[PDB]
RNA sequence: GCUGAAAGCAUCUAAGCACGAAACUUGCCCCGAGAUGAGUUCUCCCUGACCCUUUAAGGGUCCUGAAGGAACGUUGAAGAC
RNA sequence: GAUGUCGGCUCAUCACAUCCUGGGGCUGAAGUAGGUCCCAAGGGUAUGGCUGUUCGCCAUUUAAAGUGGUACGCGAGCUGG
RNA sequence: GUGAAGAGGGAAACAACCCAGACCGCCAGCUAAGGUCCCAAAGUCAUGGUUAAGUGGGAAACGAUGUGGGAAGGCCCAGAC
């Protein structure tokens, strides 16, 4: 997981989801995609 | 709120009781019970369970859908037992069932012993795979996760414990 | 005693 | 003529019992602080403790709005360097359910010898029963 | 589990056929007479009050002798308490001897340490001594700095300084029980224990386990 | 991570559950009721005459001197005192 | 009409932008060993040669020899190169 | 313009900001700024909305199916998404 201020869709399979008041990205195909806002 | 609109049928041989917010579903596979939140209103005025949001609650519509999904799975549970199949992959990976407790070998220096909850049952057709059967979809789902947690599937070779239908994205090891 | 330059 | 002033050796004091079950901590505290200071009495005097005795029951059942049931933090310093201690609302209820009321009320009462004396009339209990039946407190609803 | 009160008779050496020498502190544990039993319904905690030894009858105050008379016991050196877990019970006047430790591998020993009086920082806190030469002026073994100038402007609580050392309760944990001699009321424990010879001593089962 | 909607799917989360570190609260050790919110338990001691008016948690005389403590003396592996 | 400096010595205390130990996500992570990011301040966090030196270089160690604030902490505490 | 050479009330404390120029006395009243749950004088005041972050009670580029409102457009019971 790579943490950075800007979270975006890097590919089609990516999705943005809010879990605990923090925006993070979950990708089913490529775990490199997943990020957290911080 | 499409899920909430769809009613849930209670066929013959299934008994359902409503007492305020708590509901008790009974069937041939056992019994189940949970306490619904005050924001969801459930009625038993017909042969099908109907759901609606209680007035004054903003989350009622979204909350109503959860009750339909939860009760819909529960009625299935009492009629049929949810089944989870896990597969063991490895050179010397084996599983054994002593009853409420399962003994696994996963290359550890110590034995792995896991006890099941009262509402779950397990049995071993073969030492390379294990099957979990139960009435409640929640605990049975949790049991498999803990079973899978001991050795999550190995990326470069796939060895470990995995759901029977799981797909593992094998990755080739770095060359040179 | 002391100095400060 | 000179304005009337209350006499600490002639003031009349009566006992009350309050149930804290389901009451919001802050708004219950203000009423308790108002009563302990005697602001409701027509003979209120700033330099005389004219308040009444208050008994608080079910101190563990007080309610707090929002997410502060877990985000409310209580701070106190032991006096030693680095001796800063933390205690959330849940921890205080679990450990000492009675301190939540007194800490809230204590910060609402005046400061100084008179304020401490007024606090001494507050008697909080975690359970539903109290041993002060001899005082025959009246049921007071807030 | 319940312990016992003994006296530090001294220190001795125990030889073993294998050729190893075990330094053992000899502790004499006379009969321990229970003087009172503490109950939840009346006292709020479960414990037993015990006395050991004997003291001259001319110096037992009837407030103390009456306490002993209540339990039908002879006045001892002093009174000590031990907490009771769920499984143990005792009766007033019951006498407990050293065999209680016959099944105990490890024991806990507590007592008052030897009193060193007013001790300097070097002895009390292992402070490093400053230069004995090279120009040092009347500051060979003084504590030195004790603060950080204006910003704090004070000395923090708990600062290590010269003061009373020793003469305080100390507990030594996980002491092996070498031998129990119930025919002479003695307990042998490997290693040294706090206090001087003849001082009161409290022995309890090893809590550390 | 489980179940799972808002969003027919998906989703660790919004309702409801599980795991998770030398940090945190305990566990271990020491001080500790000046904790004036001054706590509890067990024993021990005292069961007389009167007198005055400002007649009240009043003052005073006689008798009495308990429990215990202190002081002094011999002293301590206790201690600057 | 006076707040005494660099460095050393002694004694420290706090911050976390963490050097070691602890828990994790990715890895162009086979393993061993690393890279990077996240959580974590509980403890621990070299002796010498040269130089007044801090620093630095060098020698040899260590799980590591952290970065800073505190009058570039500390001379009514020492030293005075 | 104010302080300097200006008190008083407000901004927690705070010469220069806001309100306002103290001849003396009063246990009278009405107001300014600013305020009315408690410390602490006055609304736990009456309506219609927004916020769930204790935002309010510090901070940007930038990021995000947070959530409320408004005006349009594409597809759509010839079956859309
Ligand atoms: Mg004030
Ligand atoms: Mg001594
Ligand atoms: Mg000199
Ligand atoms: Mg000298
Ligand atoms: Mg100060
Ligand atoms: Mg001067
Ligand atoms: Mg800890
Ligand atoms: Mg060096
Ligand atoms: Mg040389
Ligand atoms: Mg300096
Ligand atoms: Mg110097
Ligand atoms: Mg100085
Ligand atoms: Mg010189
Ligand atoms: Mg001038
Ligand atoms: Zn992606």
Swiss-Prot record, chain E:
Q: A Pfam family in this protein?
A: Ribosomal_L3
Keyword rRNA-binding tagged: yes
Q: Which InterPro entries match?
A: Ribosomal_uL3, Ribosomal_uL3_bac/org-type, Ribosomal_uL3_CS, Transl_B-barrel_sf
Summarize what the UniProt record says about post-translational modification: Methylated by PrmB.
> In its UniProt record, which GO terms are filed under biological process?
cytoplasmic translation; ribosomal large subunit assembly
Question: HAMAP family, per this entry?
Answer: Ribosomal_uL3_B (MF_01325_B)
Q: How does it assemble?
A: Part of the 50S ribosomal subunit. Forms a cluster with proteins L14 and L19. In pull-down experiments interacts with CedA.
Task: Tell me the protein's name.
Answer: Large ribosomal subunit protein uL3
Q: From which source organism is this entry?
A: Escherichia coli (strain K12)
Source taxonomy: Bacteria, Pseudomonadati, Pseudomonadota, Gammaproteobacteria, Enterobacterales
The gene from which this protein is expressed is rplC
């Amino acid at each position: 997981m790579k943490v950075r201020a800007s979270v975006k869709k890097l590919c089609r399979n990516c999705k943005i989801v809010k879990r605990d008041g923090v925006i993070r990205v979950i990708c089913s195909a490529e775990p490199k995609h997943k990020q957290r806002q911080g | 709120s499409r899920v909430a609109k769809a009613p849930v049928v209670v066929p013959a041989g299934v008994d359902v009781k409503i007492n305020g917010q708590v509901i008790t579903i009974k069937g041939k596979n056992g019994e189940l019970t949970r306490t619904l939140n005050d924001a969801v209103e459930v009625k038993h005025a017909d042969n099908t369970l109907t759901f609606g949001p209680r007035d004054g609650y903003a989350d009622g519509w979204a909350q109503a859908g959860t009750a339909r999904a939860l009760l819909n799975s529960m009625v299935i549970g009492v009629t049929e037992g949810f089944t989870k199949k896990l597969q063991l992959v490895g050179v010397g990976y084996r599983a054994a069932v002593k009853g409420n407790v399962i003994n696994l070998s996963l290359g550890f220096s110590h034995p792995v012993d896991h006890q099941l909850p009262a509402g779950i049952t397990a049995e071993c057709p073969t030492q390379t795979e294990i099957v979990l059967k139960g009435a409640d979809k929640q605990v049975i789902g949790q049991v498999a996760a803990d079973l899978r947690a001991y050795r999550r599937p190995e990326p470069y070779k796939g060895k470990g414990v995995r759901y029977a239908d799981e797909v593992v994205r094998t990755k080739e090891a770095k060359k040179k | 005693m002391f100095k400060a330059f | 003529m000179k304005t009337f002033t209350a006499k600490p050796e002639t003031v009349k004091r009566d006992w009350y019992v309050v149930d804290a079950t389901g009451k919001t901590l802050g708004r219950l505290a203000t009423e308790l602080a108002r009563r302990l200071r005697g602001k409701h009495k027509a003979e209120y005097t700033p330099h005389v403790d004219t308040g009444d005795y208050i008994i608080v029951l079910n101190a563990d059942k007080v309610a707090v709005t929002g997410n502060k049931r877990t985000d409310k933090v209580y701070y106190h310093h032991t006096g030693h360097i680095g001796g800063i201690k933390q205690a959330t609302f849940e921890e205080m209820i679990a450990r000492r359910p009675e301190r939540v009321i007194e800490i809230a009320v204590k910060g609402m009462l005046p400061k100084g010898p008179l304020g401490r004396a007024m606090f001494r009339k507050l008697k909080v209990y975690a359970g539903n029963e109290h041993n002060h039946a001899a005082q025959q407190p009246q049921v007071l609803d807030i | 589990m319940i312990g016992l009160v003994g006296k530090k008779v001294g220190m001795t050496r125990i030889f073993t056929e294998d050729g190893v020498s075990i330094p053992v502190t000899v502790i004499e544990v006379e009969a321990n007479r229970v003087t009172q039993v503490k109950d939840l319904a009346n006292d709020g905690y479960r414990a037993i009050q015990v006395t050991t030894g004997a003291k001259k009858a001319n110096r037992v105050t009837k407030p103390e002798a009456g306490h002993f008379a209540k339990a039908g016991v002879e006045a001892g050196r002093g009174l000590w308490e031990f907490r009771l877990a769920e499984g143990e019970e005792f009766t007033v006047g019951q006498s407990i001897s050293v065999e209680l430790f016959a099944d105990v591998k490890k024991v806990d020993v507590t007592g008052t340490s030897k009193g060193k009086g007013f001790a300097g920082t070097v002895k009390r806190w292992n402070f490093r001594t400053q230069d004995a030469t090279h120009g040092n002026s009347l500051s060979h073994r003084v504590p030195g700095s004790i603060g950080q100038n204006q910003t704090p402007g004070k000395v923090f609580k708990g600062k290590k300084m010269a003061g009373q050392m020793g003469n305080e309760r100390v507990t030594v944990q996980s002491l092996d029980v070498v031998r129990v001699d119930a025919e002479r009321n003695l307990l042998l424990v490997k290693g040294a224990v706090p206090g001087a010879t003849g001082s009161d001593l409290i022995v309890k089962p090893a809590v550390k386990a």
